[PDB]
Amino acid sequence: HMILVTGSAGRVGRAVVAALRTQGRTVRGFDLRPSGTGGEEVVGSLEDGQALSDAIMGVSAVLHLGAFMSWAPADRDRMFAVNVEGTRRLLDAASAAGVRRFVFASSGEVYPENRPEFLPVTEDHPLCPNSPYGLTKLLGEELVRFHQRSGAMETVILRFSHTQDATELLDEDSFFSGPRFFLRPRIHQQQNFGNAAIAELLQSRDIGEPSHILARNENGRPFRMHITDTRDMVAGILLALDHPEAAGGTFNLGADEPADFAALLPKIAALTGLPIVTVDFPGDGVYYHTSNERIRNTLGFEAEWTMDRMLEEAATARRQRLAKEQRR
Amino acid sequence: MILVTGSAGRVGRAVVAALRTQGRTVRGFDLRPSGTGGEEVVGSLEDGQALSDAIMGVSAVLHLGAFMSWAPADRDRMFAVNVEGTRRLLDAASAAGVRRFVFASSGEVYPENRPEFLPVTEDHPLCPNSPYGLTKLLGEELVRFHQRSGAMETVILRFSHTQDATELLDEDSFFSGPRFFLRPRIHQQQNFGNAAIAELLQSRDIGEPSHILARNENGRPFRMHITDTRDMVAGILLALDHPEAAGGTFNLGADEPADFAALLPKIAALTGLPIVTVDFPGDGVYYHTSNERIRNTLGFEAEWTMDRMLEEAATARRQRL
Ligand SMILES: NC(=O)c1ccc[n+]([C@@H]2O[C@H](COP(=O)([O-])OP(=O)(O)OC[C@H]3O[C@@H](n4cnc5c(N)ncnc54)[C@H](O)[C@@H]3O)[C@@H](O)[C@H]2O)c1
Ligand SMILES: NC(=O)c1ccc[n+]([C@@H]2O[C@H](COP(=O)([O-])OP(=O)(O)OC[C@H]3O[C@@H](n4cnc5c(N)ncnc54)[C@H](O)[C@@H]3O)[C@@H](O)[C@H]2O)c1
Ligand SMILES: [Cl-]
Ligand SMILES: [Cl-]
Incomplete structure (x- = not known):
C-alpha cells in the first residue's frame, strides 16, 4: 500500500x-x-x-x-x-x-x-x-x-x-482568524484585497486601541458559520x-454546530481581555x-x-x- | 454584431x-x-x-x-x-x-x-x-x-x-455512413480500434454492400x-x-426519435440496398x-x-x- x-x-x-x-x-x-x-x-x-x-x-x-x-x-x-x-x-x-x-x-x-x-x-x-x-x-x-x-x-x-488549527483562533497574525476576530487585522486584510468601502468602514469603527470585531450583517444579524x-x-x-x-x-x-458570533465573541473577549467593536456589514452577511x-x-x-x-x-x-513577548 | x-x-x-x-x-x-x-x-x-x-x-x-x-x-x-x-x-x-x-x-x-x-x-x-x-x-x-x-x-x-439532410444516404458521411451502411461502419470501428466489434460486423457482410439495422443484444432496434x-x-x-x-x-x-426498425426499410426503399440486421452486445441506444x-x-x-x-x-x- 501507499x-x-x-x-x-x-x-x-x-x-x-x-x-x-x-x-x-x-x-x-x-x-x-x-x-x-x-x-x-x-x-x-x-x-x-x-x-x-x-x-x-x-x-x-x-x-x-x-x-x-x-x-x-x-x-x-x-x-x-x-x-x-x-x-x-x-x-x-x-x-x-x-x-x-x-x-x-x-x-x-x-x-x-x-x-x-x-x-x-x-x-x-x-x-x-x-x-x-x-x-x-x-x-x-x-x-x-x-x-x-x-x-x-x-x-x-x-x-x-x-x-x-485551534491555536490560530486567537492569533492576530493568522491568515483567517486574525481578520475574523480582530478589527485591525481585518482593516489590513480588506485594504490589501482592495475593498476600500469595507476597509474605510472598519477604520471608522476603530476605538483607538486594538479590539475584537463582532461581524453582523446589514440588519444587525450576527455572523454564523x-x-x-x-x-x-x-x-x-x-x-x-x-x-x-x-x-x-x-x-x-x-x-x-456553527459558531454563533454573538455568543462566540464575548467568550473570545473573556480570554483575551480585548474590547469588542460590533460592525454591521452591507449585504446578507455570513449565516449558515x-x-x-x-x-x-x-x-x-x-x-x-x-x-x-x-x-x-x-x-x-x-x-x-x-509571556514570551513580555519576558514573563 | x-x-x-x-x-x-x-x-x-x-x-x-x-x-x-x-x-x-x-x-x-x-x-x-x-x-x-x-x-x-x-x-x-x-x-x-x-x-x-x-x-x-x-x-x-x-x-x-x-x-x-x-x-x-x-x-x-x-x-x-x-x-x-x-x-x-x-x-x-x-x-x-x-x-x-x-x-x-x-x-x-x-x-x-x-x-x-x-x-x-x-x-x-x-x-x-x-x-x-x-x-x-x-x-x-x-x-x-x-x-x-x-x-x-x-x-x-x-x-x-x-x-444535413444530404448526409443521411451518403456512405462517406462521418456519422450517417456508419450509422446506416455496414461497410462504412466496419471501417469506422476499425479506425477506432474496436477490432472485435469490427470483426462481428465483418462476419455479417453478405458479399455486397448493404445497410445495417442496429439492434441491441436482445434485438431491440436502436431509437434516437x-x-x-x-x-x-x-x-x-x-x-x-x-x-x-x-x-x-x-x-x-x-x-420524435427515429426507430431504426421503421427507418431502415424506408432507407432501403430509396437506395435499393439489402439490409443486414446486427444485434450488438449490450443495451444499445434507445431514447x-x-x-x-x-x-x-x-x-x-x-x-x-x-x-x-x-x-x-x-x-x-x-x-x-
Ligand atoms: N482550510 C479551510 O478552511 C478549507 C475550507 C474548505 C475547503 N478547503 C479545501 O480543503 C483543501 C485543504 O484545505 P487547507 O486549509 O489545508 O488548504 P491550504 O491552502 O492550507 O493548503 C493547500 C495546499 O495546496 C498546495 N498547492 C497549491 N497549488 C498546488 C499545485 N499546483 N500543486 C501541488 N500543490 C499545490 C499548496 O501549496 C498548499 O500547501 C483544499 O482543497 C481547500 O481548498 C479548505
Ligand atoms: N452535430 C451533432 O450531432 C451534435 C450533437 C450534440 C452536440 N453538438 C454540438 O453542437 C455544436 C455544433 O456541432 P456541429 O455539428 O456543427 O459540429 P462540427 O464538428 O461540424 O463543427 C464544430 C466546429 O468547431 C470548430 N472548432 C473546433 N475546435 C476549435 C477551436 N479550438 N477554436 C475554434 N473553433 C474550433 C471546428 O473547426 C468545427 O468547424 C458543437 O458544439 C457540437 O459539439 C453537435
Ligand atoms: Cl467573517
Ligand atoms: Cl448507431
Missing part, C-alpha cells in the same frame, strides 16, 4: 500525513512546496504531467487536498489550471494506475454556504457556486462523479468546513479513506448551518473538538506567546 | 448563412475558414489573442465551436477547447458587455445513451458517461455561473444529434433523435432573439427526448420530418451516383 496526499504542506494535508505516519502507514506527499517534515514527498505542481506521473507511481489510494485559492483576477487562470485541469489529470492517472480509492477535498462554496436556500445545508442542497473558487470545486466534483460512475476506482467527495478543528477534519478524512461505506459517497465534513448528519450516520463520524475546547487551547497558546 | 464560434462547422455555417441572408451583422470564429469569404476569425478558442479579436464590438455570442474525439491522445485538447475555451470566451464576452450568450450543449450531458427515465426532460439528472459529455456538462456549469452572477443573458441548448440542421438553426435563432429564452435551458431537436419546453416557451416548431429529410437525401444520392 497513500498519496496532495496538498501535504497545507493545513489539513500536513495533519493528515502526520496522522497516517503515526499509524506507520506508507505515505507520499505531493505539494508545490516542501512540507518541512522531511517525509517522502514529491515537491512539484499538479499542473505538471511529469510530477503527476512520479507522484502516482505505486500508489493505492489518493487523498486529493491540493488546490489553489486567490481573489486576484490575475490568478484566476492558475486557479482553474490547478483545481480543474490538475484534478482531471490526477483522476485519470490514478485510475490508469489502478488506485483503489480517490478522496476529493471539496468545499461548502459549491452550494454556496454564503448564500443558502435553506438551513441546515444538506448534501442535496443545490450546487450553485457564486465565487470562482466555488466554481472550480464544483467542476472538480463533476470530474470525480464521472470516475465514480465509470471505473473500478472508488471515489469519496468531502465538502470541507472552514478549518483552523462552521469553524472546524483540523483534528476533526483529519479524523473524517481517515474515515473516508478506510471505511467501506464511504465508497461512492458525498459528505459534508465539519463539526456539528451545515448538516453533517450523513457522515455521522454513514461512517460513524463524531467531532470531538467543540469550540469551547478549541478556545481553551487557543488561549493557552496566546498566553504563552504574550 | 453577432459572433458565431464553430462557424465553419455543420450547424455554425448554417446559422451564419441564415443570419447573413437576413442582413444581420455576423462575425465567424473557427479553426478553419468557412470558404464563404465572409467576415470571420480563423483561429482557436485556446488562443487569448483570437478571443480578444473575435469579441470586439460583439453584442451576442452563439457558441457552437467545440472539439470531439474518442481517442485518449485527443482528450487534453477536447478539455482545452470545450472547457477552458468556453470559460475564457464567457469571461471575454461578459467583460465586453455582450447582451446574450447562447451555448451549444449536448444530450450527452444526461446521457441520452443511458437514460434514467423517458422521455428525457431538462430536469433529467446530468450524469455524462463520455469524456465529451463531461466537457459539455462542465461548459454548462460555466454558463450557469455567468447566468447567476452577471448581467449577460445566457441560453443553454442541448442539441439533438444533427445532420436525428434532427435536420435547418430545424436546429431555427431553434438557435429563437434562442438569440426570443425574450423568454433568457436564463433558459432547452432540449433542441425534433419531436426519446422531450422538446416540450422549447415548443411551449419559444414557439419552436420542428418542420423537417424524417420523411422530408430522406426525400432530400435520396435526391442528393441520385445526383451523386
Whole structure:
C-alpha cells in the first residue's frame, strides 16, 4: 500500500500525513512546496504531467487536498489550471494506475454556504457556486462523479468546513482568524484585497486601541458559520479513506454546530481581555448551518473538538506567546 | 454584431448563412475558414489573442465551436477547447458587455445513451458517461455561473444529434455512413480500434454492400433523435432573439426519435440496398427526448420530418451516383 496526499504542506494535508505516519502507514506527499517534515514527498505542481506521473507511481489510494485559492483576477487562470485541469489529470492517472480509492477535498462554496436556500445545508442542497473558487470545486466534483460512475476506482467527495488549527483562533497574525476576530487585522486584510468601502468602514469603527470585531450583517444579524478543528477534519478524512461505506459517497465534513458570533465573541473577549467593536456589514452577511448528519450516520463520524475546547487551547497558546513577548 | 464560434462547422455555417441572408451583422470564429469569404476569425478558442479579436464590438455570442474525439491522445485538447475555451470566451464576452450568450450543449450531458427515465426532460439528472459529455456538462456549469452572477443573458441548448439532410444516404458521411451502411461502419470501428466489434460486423457482410439495422443484444432496434440542421438553426435563432429564452435551458431537436426498425426499410426503399440486421452486445441506444419546453416557451416548431429529410437525401444520392 501507499497513500498519496496532495496538498501535504497545507493545513489539513500536513495533519493528515502526520496522522497516517503515526499509524506507520506508507505515505507520499505531493505539494508545490516542501512540507518541512522531511517525509517522502514529491515537491512539484499538479499542473505538471511529469510530477503527476512520479507522484502516482505505486500508489493505492489518493487523498486529493491540493488546490489553489486567490481573489486576484490575475490568478484566476492558475486557479482553474490547478483545481480543474490538475484534478482531471490526477483522476485519470490514478485510475490508469489502478488506485483503489480517490478522496476529493471539496468545499461548502459549491452550494454556496454564503448564500443558502435553506438551513441546515444538506448534501442535496443545490450546487450553485457564486465565487470562482466555488466554481472550480464544483467542476472538480463533476470530474470525480464521472470516475465514480465509470471505473473500478472508488471515489469519496468531502465538502470541507472552514478549518483552523485551534491555536490560530486567537492569533492576530493568522491568515483567517486574525481578520475574523480582530478589527485591525481585518482593516489590513480588506485594504490589501482592495475593498476600500469595507476597509474605510472598519477604520471608522476603530476605538483607538486594538479590539475584537463582532461581524453582523446589514440588519444587525450576527455572523454564523462552521469553524472546524483540523483534528476533526483529519479524523473524517481517515474515515473516508478506510471505511467501506464511504465508497461512492458525498459528505459534508465539519463539526456539528456553527459558531454563533454573538455568543462566540464575548467568550473570545473573556480570554483575551480585548474590547469588542460590533460592525454591521452591507449585504446578507455570513449565516449558515451545515448538516453533517450523513457522515455521522454513514461512517460513524463524531467531532470531538467543540469550540469551547478549541478556545481553551487557543488561549493557552496566546498566553504563552504574550509571556514570551513580555519576558514573563 | 453577432459572433458565431464553430462557424465553419455543420450547424455554425448554417446559422451564419441564415443570419447573413437576413442582413444581420455576423462575425465567424473557427479553426478553419468557412470558404464563404465572409467576415470571420480563423483561429482557436485556446488562443487569448483570437478571443480578444473575435469579441470586439460583439453584442451576442452563439457558441457552437467545440472539439470531439474518442481517442485518449485527443482528450487534453477536447478539455482545452470545450472547457477552458468556453470559460475564457464567457469571461471575454461578459467583460465586453455582450447582451446574450447562447451555448451549444449536448444530450450527452444526461446521457441520452443511458437514460434514467423517458422521455428525457431538462430536469433529467446530468450524469455524462463520455469524456465529451463531461466537457459539455462542465461548459454548462460555466454558463450557469455567468447566468447567476452577471448581467449577460445566457441560453443553454442541448442539441439533438444533427445532420444535413444530404448526409443521411451518403456512405462517406462521418456519422450517417456508419450509422446506416455496414461497410462504412466496419471501417469506422476499425479506425477506432474496436477490432472485435469490427470483426462481428465483418462476419455479417453478405458479399455486397448493404445497410445495417442496429439492434441491441436482445434485438431491440436502436431509437434516437436525428434532427435536420435547418430545424436546429431555427431553434438557435429563437434562442438569440426570443425574450423568454433568457436564463433558459432547452432540449433542441425534433419531436420524435427515429426507430431504426421503421427507418431502415424506408432507407432501403430509396437506395435499393439489402439490409443486414446486427444485434450488438449490450443495451444499445434507445431514447426519446422531450422538446416540450422549447415548443411551449419559444414557439419552436420542428418542420423537417424524417420523411422530408430522406426525400432530400435520396435526391442528393441520385445526383451523386
Ligand atoms: N482550510 C479551510 O478552511 C478549507 C475550507 C474548505 C475547503 N478547503 C479545501 O480543503 C483543501 C485543504 O484545505 P487547507 O486549509 O489545508 O488548504 P491550504 O491552502 O492550507 O493548503 C493547500 C495546499 O495546496 C498546495 N498547492 C497549491 N497549488 C498546488 C499545485 N499546483 N500543486 C501541488 N500543490 C499545490 C499548496 O501549496 C498548499 O500547501 C483544499 O482543497 C481547500 O481548498 C479548505
Ligand atoms: N452535430 C451533432 O450531432 C451534435 C450533437 C450534440 C452536440 N453538438 C454540438 O453542437 C455544436 C455544433 O456541432 P456541429 O455539428 O456543427 O459540429 P462540427 O464538428 O461540424 O463543427 C464544430 C466546429 O468547431 C470548430 N472548432 C473546433 N475546435 C476549435 C477551436 N479550438 N477554436 C475554434 N473553433 C474550433 C471546428 O473547426 C468545427 O468547424 C458543437 O458544439 C457540437 O459539439 C453537435
Ligand atoms: Cl467573517
Ligand atoms: Cl448507431
